[PDB]
Design a protein around this ligand. Structure first.
Ligand SMILES: Nc1nc2c(ncn2[C@@H]2O[C@H](COP(=O)(O)OP(=O)(O)OP(=O)(O)O)[C@@H](O)[C@H]2O)c(=O)[nH]1
Ligand SMILES: Nc1nc2c(ncn2[C@@H]2O[C@H](COP(=O)(O)OP(=O)(O)OP(=O)(O)O)[C@@H](O)[C@H]2O)c(=O)[nH]1
Ligand SMILES: Nc1nc2c(ncn2[C@@H]2O[C@H](COP(=O)(O)OP(=O)(O)OP(=O)(O)O)[C@@H](O)[C@H]2O)c(=O)[nH]1
Lengths: 41, 54, 438, 144, 50, 427, 438
């Protein structure tokens, strides 16, 4: 509760799309263990 | 009769120079902006002096 | 091969497709640059992306979807985002004028000189495709721009492409909430124009989506980020059969063969069972039995329809994750023995099962739980005629008092088209009534 | 002026018949995609030709196909000939409207200037300086 | 219900009806042939008898 | 792209236009000299709806100032933002109005409408494709009514395909200063409803009351009143300029507002009005907003629709909000107040949310109202009109101008029709 | 051998040939001085230049072209340019008096005393040549000097040498843009005079050239530099068969035989498919299929004609770059079987392919793309008659009210073959529809 108390935004001129959809970390990415693995043609 | 096509090394040489071409195209804009705004500054100063004379 | 094209008509239908395409890259290895790491998956464009993305010799995955919009604000704004470099520039079909919520304005005034351009886009996408099972049409019934422009283009793509499937998805008008009183007018206009062309139309309502949010997800103040995420999960699940495999694999063609009983009516209902918070999933357990009960729990539907006021026809289960047929076949048998579950006597069996071993994944910075066993509850019931029932006694009022007609007759319509739809509707409920009678 | 309202509705209904008969053309000239064409059992269904077998003449389905295409093309010509005339006639009525309206408006500002000089005041010189300019001459002459 | 189907001529849904208007004749000859297939098939059968 | 050209009409709009534009400039952060200080990309990108580009990053207001009295022009020109305005757009006359409607409608207009039409068409060709126009003036204002009725008429045939927004203030019901003001309003409103499509109705007495209700500062300036109406007028314009999922077009709004063409007169509603301690005594929540948004004291337009019923209601929400609270607030108010709407139309609410907050406050909104509360307005002017037309006082001037009783007959007869029109639809 | 002589008539036709020879020097690496590097390719003039340049013992590449103009300004400007040392001085045939846009003034008043001069150049060019398959004529229908001057010459060129080909190239008059109103006068004078003598006349229209540029090349402010580079690349592509070889080698004689069906009409239309911007080529890929769709896409034609309002007779495509016949013959098989493309049933096949291995290159200071698979689309259709149909109704009005006749009758004419011109034209449309009539 104490940190949120400020409730004073720094960059108020932010579109939700920028806030909602920023660039996600690279290391948090899913691996295709069994997603129809067809290395052969 | 047997030529099987180019190699990618040419294609990498291909893709690069367009990246260049865009860059000098970008500065070509920007410099003209400078060239254009110079004319106004010349127009500003001559008009200013004209008001001095008036 | 097994690929499709997605259609996103209406600025309402573009942020949802944005989120869906954000979600899709979160399992396909995709970086925001447009390429993999040094790991070898690029080529002629043939891997898990080949059904979804187009990663040609250039190495950049080109999504197989087109975002069409008529107000440049959002589309230019998303053209400045994070994945905009992936998005093809003029696949992001923008516009400079709106439809004023007017279906006809979006169908007659401006759609003429724009559809030809997008017709060029689809053919250049159609030719590069190989199997192209069908189309994924994302729209909205109460579309300010989704309504009118879609109807013309779906007509145009129907006449030139009358054999492949067309998948329709629209936010259904809220039963009690109306941000615009002009919404019903165009909504019935959309329905009557689409009943004879649309293949499979799927509907959804945000209110009970929000009701879920503070019931089990326990969020009193969610957002579209959550709202867009969950439908993106829903469409991700139905598309997992293309991406992954399972004990048995199913395709959209089987869905349309098995879900729709009779012509005209093509309006089933989807539902995702394991909708729960992370902590609730943490110190509890998931198995087929309870998620089966949850997916058939009437309050878990995003649709305001009481199944006990209607009767079931179909129920399609798509189990994505680790499961065995034993408990599946055992649990459904118990569900058949359930007496509250009221299918029509016409159908002895109505269960379409799709098994997929891929465990559904979380999204970074997400809100969903940690799912190993998931299922999408695709079903059709007679408890839906009330949705068309509520809008007619709505609509018949305003048409009698002919509200806002000066607007529509102002830019070039007449009342006959409005007339046609009402008995078309009057045909719909009686058909719903007649098929409801056994 | 009452007519000017009336024709629009006629135009609105006249135009609508045209659009779906182009659609009706598409629904009778195939989907214009050979590479999807097969899935609908390429016209002559394999079953039909193997049905032919002993054959002995064939189906008049091609005959109705030719005939149906011929008819819709004919109606296309009929309406287009009729359609083109309509816009020309409409604009003439639209143009005639403008001439009528402006005519009285310019004519209107005649009586009013008289009463501006009946009054007990006003004398000779006020009239003549303003005779040559009482209204900017420019009778609006469809100015643009 | 007013009687509507008389002739006019515009047929927005026409190919599909005509397609099934091939279905009767294609099956029609099949029924007749099997009658001949019936009489010829047994004929040889008991013929092989003697 | 679609843009707007503004008109400053009457000597009231001369103050209003001055305040309305400086609010926009301060909103967009341009200094009074005109050299924009690049700070916000979104407003940098959506200034072209109202402003063109001049040399050196100066943003020219695409508005027209018109008057007859030079002193008001000099005062606004000598103002902090007269420099950003153009002498090209300062069209004025060589005469004093006497604030005669007919003189401004027939005598002085004739030699000035030609000039202003050239100016606007030059400005019209300076831009690509307008949404339409908006005009700031007064219905009881002698010069503004005189020219406006002329100008709105001429623009109609010139461009009948755009938005003819009108912003007019209703004079004080208790006192009008101008004794011929009831004559002026009756004359204007005849052509107004015939030419207009939208009309904002504003009264000064409520503004004084609002100063009494919340400002609590005893003696304000009329510019402060202009600050309020500019803020209200700015709020509705925030939709077009700003991003966020709210469909902004006034036609998008108007088709939601106008079930029948005669519905042109609309009533505003604004966002938190705050007193001396309540700036830091307020827990800014959508409930207490929505509560304050539908307050019988929060109105400023004419009077209490408590006497009547609610035809159409639309509110735009400016700031960081969400679909759920605005939805439930609508559910709350609909259940709170169901019967006092008309049974003719339920679900009469139109909701829009602008995600971009204003500068200084975060959670804001704006409301536009169309309720059956105009009956008191034109019925009031009816008794005033009939009483003065009972004995034809102050009539020799207009006969001197070239006026006779006949035009009043249809002017009031059309007015009487609207009285019965407004009543019979609701009643 | 395989050489030709180029002719550039008209101060409009002089900057284009300047640009074309500028383009031509790059692919051969011609230094502006006039000589190769220390590399050994010079000799008696027998290498890649032997077909185009005359790099004789002097070692200076002398182009086999003649620039003829009637006003000294531009030619005196270009002879002060960069490659003026390469250009032969009196091959740059200059003039001091204009034709004032008048056809016959450039045909009678001044052309008499200069044709003998240029006839000296051609025969002195003729003697040095060996095979000289034909000629390259660049002119303009709206020729202030190009129209009248070339008319007498080509007549004199036809009578003395009628045993070889004459290739005609002119900017077609803009259908709705007219910078001159005597342009309909001189244009119809050119067409009728050329009909019985011109071997192959090819036209282009600038408006759609501009329309392409801001469509795909995305340049809202191009120039002749870009305009002339486009057409300069067009003539470069058709001359690549002479420059390099391919899988098969095709020649203008084969072009003539296989393009013109019958007497008179010898007016196909060229088109270049891979006209795309740089960055669009960057994150996208080129292959035979889509360029084959693009090449037949109606909006890619620089002449305002609708192929669905006409019918096709011939189509010649010139594949420059790396292609395999497998995808070539497969793609055209789809194209031949395409429904919309309405070839005349008189021709079962109408396709002439020219393969060239050499990839098309960019010019320094250019704006084109870097194409590995290019094609020039030479095709003739019946959709062209509307242009002359547009021409005649312009002329029939003008001529009836006989504007500017005092100008023409002033210096020695009257209205006589202004009449024969229109029924010569009226012959054209009736022939055009008769061949259209199956
Ligand atoms: N699909 C979708 N709909 C939303 C979202 N947020 C709110 N909505 C609702 O969806 C409707 C969108 O319909 P329209 O407003 O007609 O959309 P449009 O036709 O593309 O044109 P616009 O009015 O400019 O948006 C609105 O009425 C909202 O009630 C969202 O994120 N996605
Ligand atoms: N600018 C301004 N106008 C005011 C103020 N107070 C009241 N008004 C009214 O605003 C109205 C509109 O101004 P105009 O239309 O320009 O005035 P007008 O046409 O010359 O006619 P008048 O009403 O006599 O002034 C006037 O009628 C005034 O009564 C104020 O403080 N400032
Ligand atoms: N070929 C060519 N044509 C151009 C160029 N620039 C403009 N044009 C068009 O080509 C036409 C030029 O033809 P003419 O004016 O008759 O040229 P001319 O007969 O050599 O003599 P002039 O009248 O002096 O130019 C103009 O009408 C333009 O529309 C260009 O660089 N090259």
């Amino acid at each position: 509760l104490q940190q949120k108390w400020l409730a004073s935004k720094t960059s108020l001129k932010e579109s939700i799309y920028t806030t909602s959809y920023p660039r996600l970390p690279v290391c948090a990415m899913s691996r295709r263990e069994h997603a129809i693995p067809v290395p052969h043609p | 009769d047997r030529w099987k096509g180019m190699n990618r090394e040419q294609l990498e040489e291909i893709w690069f120079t367009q990246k260049r071409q865009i860059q000098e195209k970008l500065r070509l804009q920007e410099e003209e902006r400078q060239h254009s705004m110079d004319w106004d500054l010349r127009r500003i100063r001559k008009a200013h002096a004209s008001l001095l004379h008036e | 091969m097994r690929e499709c094209i997605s259609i996103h008509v209406g600025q309402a239908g573009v942020q949802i497709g944005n989120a869906c395409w954000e979600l899709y890259c979160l399992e396909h290895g995709i970086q925001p640059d447009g390429q993999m790491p040094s790991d070898k998956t690029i080529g002629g464009g043939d891997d898990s992306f080949n059904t979804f993305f187009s990663e040609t010799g250039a190495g950049k995955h080109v999504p197989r979807a087109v975002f069409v919009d008529l107000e440049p604000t959002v589309v230019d704004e998303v053209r400045t985002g994070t994945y905009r470099q992936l998005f093809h520039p003029e696949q992001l079909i923008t516009g400079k004028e709106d439809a004023a919520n007017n279906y006809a304005r979006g169908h007659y005034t401006i759609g003429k000189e724009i559809v030809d351009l997008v017709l060029d886009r689809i053919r250049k996408l159609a030719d590069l495709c190989t199997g192209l099972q069908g189309f994924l049409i994302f729209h909205s019934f109460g579309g300010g721009t989704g309504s009118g422009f879609a109807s013309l283009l779906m007509e145009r793509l129907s006449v030139d492409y009358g054999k492949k499937s067309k998948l329709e998805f629209a936010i259904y008008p809220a039963p009690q909430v109306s941000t615009a009183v002009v919404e019903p007018y165009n909504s019935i206009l959309t329905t009557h124009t689409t009943l004879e062309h649309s293949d499979c139309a799927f509907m959804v309502d945000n209110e009970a989506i929000y009701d879920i949010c503070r019931r089990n997800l326990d969020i009193e103040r969610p957002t579209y980020t959550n709202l867009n995420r969950l439908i993106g999960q829903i469409v991700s699940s139905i598309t997992a059969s293309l991406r992954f495999d399972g004990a048995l694999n199913v395709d959209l063609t089987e869905f349309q063969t098995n879900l729709v009983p009779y012509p005209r009516i093509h309006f089933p209902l989807a539902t995702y069972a394991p909708v729960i918070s992370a902590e609730k999933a943490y110190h509890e357990q998931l198995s087929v039995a309870e998620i089966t009960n949850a997916c058939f729990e009437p309050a878990n539907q995003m649709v305001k329809c009481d199944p006990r006021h209607g009767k079931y026809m179909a129920c399609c289960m798509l189990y994505r994750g680790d499961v065995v047929p034993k408990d599946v076949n055992a649990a459904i048998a118990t569900i058949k023995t359930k007496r509250t579950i009221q299918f029509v006597d016409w159908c002895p069996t109505g269960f379409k099962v799709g098994i997929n071993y891929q465990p559904p994944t979380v999204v970074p910075g997400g809100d969903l739980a940690k799912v190993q066993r998931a299922v999408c509850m695709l079903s059709n019931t007679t408890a839906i005629a009330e949705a068309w029932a509520r809008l007619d006694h709505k609509f018949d009022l305003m048409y009698a008092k002919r509200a806002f007609v000066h607007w529509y007759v102002g830019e070039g319509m007449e009342e006959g088209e409005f007339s046609e739809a009402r008995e078309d509707l009057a045909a719909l409920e009686k058909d719903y009534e007649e098929v409801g009678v056994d | 002026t009452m007519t000017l309202g009336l024709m629009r509705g006629t135009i609105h209904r006249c135009m609508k018949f045209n659009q779906e008969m182009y659609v009706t053309r598409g629904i009778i000239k195939g989907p214009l995609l050979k590479r999807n064409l097969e899935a609908r059992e390429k016209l002559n269904r394999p079953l039909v030709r193997m049905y032919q077998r002993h054959v002995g003449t064939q189906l008049p389905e091609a005959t109705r196909l030719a005939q149906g295409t011929d008819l819709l093309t004919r109606h296309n010509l009929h309406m287009e000939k009729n359609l083109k005339e309509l816009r020309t006639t409409h604009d003439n009525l639209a143009w005639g409207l403008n001439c009528k309206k402006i005519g009285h408006d310019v004519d209107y500002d005649v009586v009013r200037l008289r009463l501006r000089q009946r009054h007990p005041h006003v004398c000779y010189e006020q009239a003549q300086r303003l005779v040559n300019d009482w209204d900017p001459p420019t009778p609006a002459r469809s100015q643009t | 219900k007013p009687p509507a189907w008389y002739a006019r001529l515009p047929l927005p849904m026409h190919r599909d009806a005509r397609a099934q208007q091939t279905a009767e004749v294609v099956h029609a000859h099949a029924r007749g042939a099997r009658l001949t297939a019936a009489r010829l098939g047994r004929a040889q059968h008991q013929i092989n008898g003697q | 792209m679609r843009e707007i050209v503004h008109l400053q009409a009457g000597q009231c709009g001369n103050q209003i236009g001055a305040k309305f534009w400086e609010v926009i400039s301060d909103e967009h952060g341009i200094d009074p000299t005109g050299t924009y200080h690049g700070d916000s990309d979104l407003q940098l990108e959506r200034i072209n709806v109202y402003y063109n580009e001049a040399t050196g990053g100066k943003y020219v207001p695409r508005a027209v100032l018109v008057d007859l009295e030079p002193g008001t022009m000099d005062s606004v020109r000598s103002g902090p933002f007269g420099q950003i305005f153009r002498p090209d757009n300062f069209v004025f006359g060589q005469s004093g109005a006497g604030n005669n409607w007919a003189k401004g409608h027939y005598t002085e207009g004739a030699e000035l409408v030609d000039s202003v039409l050239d100016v606007v068409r030059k400005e019209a060709e300076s831009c690509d494709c307008l949404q339409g126009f908006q005009l700031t003036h007064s219905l009881g204002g002698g010069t503004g009514s005189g020219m406006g009725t002329l100008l709105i008429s001429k623009i109609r045939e010139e461009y009948p395909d755009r938005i003819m927004n009108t912003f007019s203030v209703v004079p004080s019901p208790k006192v009008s200063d101008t004794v011929v003001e009831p004559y002026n309003a009756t004359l204007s409103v005849h052509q107004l409803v015939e030419n207009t499509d939208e009309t904002y109705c504003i009264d000064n007495e409520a503004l004084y009351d609002i100063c009494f209700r919340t400002l609590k500062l005893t003696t304000p300036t009329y510019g402060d009143l202009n600050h309020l109406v500019s803020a209200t007028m700015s709020g509705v314009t925030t939709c077009l300029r700003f991003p966020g999922q709210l469909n902004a077009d006034l036609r998008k709004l108007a088709v939601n507002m106008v079930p029948f063409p005669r519905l042109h007169f609309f009533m505003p509603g604004f966002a938190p009005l705050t007193s001396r301690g309540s700036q830091q005594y307020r827990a800014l929540t959508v409930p207490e907003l929505t509560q304050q948004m539908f307050d019988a004291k929060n109105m400023m337009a004419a009077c209490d629709p408590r006497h009547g019923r609610y035809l159409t209601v639309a509110a735009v929400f400016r700031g960081r909000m969400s679909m759920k609270e605005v939805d439930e607030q609508m559910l709350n108010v609909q259940n709170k107040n169901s019967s006092y709407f008309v049974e003719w139309i339920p679900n009469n609410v139109k909701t829009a949310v602008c995600d971009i907050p204003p500068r200084g406050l975060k959670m804001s909104a704006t409301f536009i109202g169309n309720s059956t509360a105009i009956q008191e307005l034109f019925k009031r002017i009816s008794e005033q009109f009939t009483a003065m037309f009972r004995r034809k006082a102050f009539l020799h001037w207009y006969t001197g101008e070239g006026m006779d009783e006949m035009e009043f007959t249809e002017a009031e007869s059309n007015m009487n029709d609207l009285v019965s029109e407004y009543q019979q639809y609701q009643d």
